Amino acid sequence: GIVEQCCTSICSLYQLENYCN
Amino acid sequence: FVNQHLCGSHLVEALYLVCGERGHFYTPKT
Numbered sequence: 001g002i003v004e005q006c007c008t009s010i011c012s013l014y015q016l017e018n019y020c021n
Numbered sequence: 022f023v024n025q026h027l028c029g030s031h032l033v034e035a036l037y038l039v040c041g042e043r044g045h046f047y048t049p050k051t
Contacts (some may be wrong), residue, residue, distance in 0.1 A: 007028035
């Protein structure tokens with residue numbers, strides 16, 4: 001999920017948006 | 022926005038910036 005996308009390494013607005021579902 | 026590492030409260034803050042602000046901000050007609 002979002003923690004495994006942004007907490008471990010760099011994420012960006014255009015892809016982190018996708019996890020608001 | 023800033024592309025960086027984000028976790029916990031910092032991640033909740035980012036979700037507000039990308040999606041949560043757009044929840045109460047205006048959306049014009051298509």
